[PDB]
């Protein structure tokens, strides 16, 4: 497997501190808090409030007087419920909507692959196998060759590493945006326009 060869050269993939089952408790909690408690659990103790009232607020947030919701409540239900159903149809056949994620997973395994292939390159030295340079020559020559191996591989790391740092910051900014949306969009109601879509 891809992980196995990686696992074999010194490339290890440490476990994410939070297992998916843990993430699914958070994204349950936030999701279960928002439903019952309104937004108030981000500002303090969660306050149970009737959801159908919670919407009578979140309209005042957009400037629509709440008397629209209590009257249109049913019609808003089906519009919500159906709009949910559309989501699951989209994902059912959409590979692309996850392109943002799928790209991130790719680009890492990409540079991870390329990092590995660089173990097969001569880099100017007479071979890309470490020992096969040794047993061919008397070491005082190998000290010279193994440079062009090390000088090659050491570089290829610093390429890969310096990549990750740059790529890490790219995720870093994206993670900050997610915290901003998680904070403002989910736990609040965002007055910002087209920040939440």
């Amino acid at each position: 497997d891809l992980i196995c060869a990686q696992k074999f050269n010194g490339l290890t993939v440490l476990p994410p501190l939070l297992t998916d089952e843990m993430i699914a408790q958070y994204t349950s909690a936030l999701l279960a808090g928002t439903i019952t408690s309104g937004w108030t659990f981000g500002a303090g103790a969660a306050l149970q409030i009737p959801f159908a009232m919670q919407m009578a607020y979140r309209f005042n947030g957009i400037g629509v007087t709440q008397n629209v919701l209590y009257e249109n409540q049913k019609l808003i239900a089906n519009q919500f419920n159906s709009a949910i159903g559309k989501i699951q149809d989209s994902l059912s056949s959409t590979a692309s909507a996850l392109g943002k994620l799928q790209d991130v997973v790719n680009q890492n395994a990409q540079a991870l692959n390329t990092l590995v292939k660089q173990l097969s390159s001569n880099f100017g030295a007479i071979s890309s196998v470490l020992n096969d340079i040794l047993s061919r020559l008397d070491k005082v020559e190998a000290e010279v060759q193994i440079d062009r191996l090390i000088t090659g591989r050491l570089q290829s790391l610093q390429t890969y590493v310096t990549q990750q740092l740059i790529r890490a910051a790219e995720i870093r900014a994206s993670a900050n945006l997610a915290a901003t949306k998680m904070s403002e969009c989910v736990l609040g109601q965002s007055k910002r326009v087209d920040f939440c879509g």
Partner: protein
């Protein structure tokens, strides 16, 4: 020709192919003329025993970062070591 080692870290040579791994029984199925198997990474993943044809995986012996888990040296001198990503034998 030296007796083959199964389920134990061994240096090895097969037909001049050399490496170090953990040789196991494996169900991947060669075409007859073939010699090696290989993985995506151009590693030597699986080899066939010349004398008794059998499909032998090669997994190089496990390794991982030692992690010393400690409270502050302030509170204690006691540490709990974490060997990362190994089954607990090779301790």
């Amino acid at each position: 020709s030296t007796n083959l080692v199964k389920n134990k870290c061994v240096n090895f040579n097969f037909n001049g192919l050399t490496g170090t791994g953990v040789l196991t029984e494996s169900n991947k199925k060669f075409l007859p003329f073939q010699q090696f198997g290989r993985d995506i990474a151009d590693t030597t993943d699986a080899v066939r025993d010349p004398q008794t044809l059998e499909i032998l995986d090669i997994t190089p012996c496990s390794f991982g970062g030692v992690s010393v888990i400690t409270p502050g040296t302030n509170t204690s001198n006691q540490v709990a070591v974490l060997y990362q990503d190994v089954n607990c034998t090779e301790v």
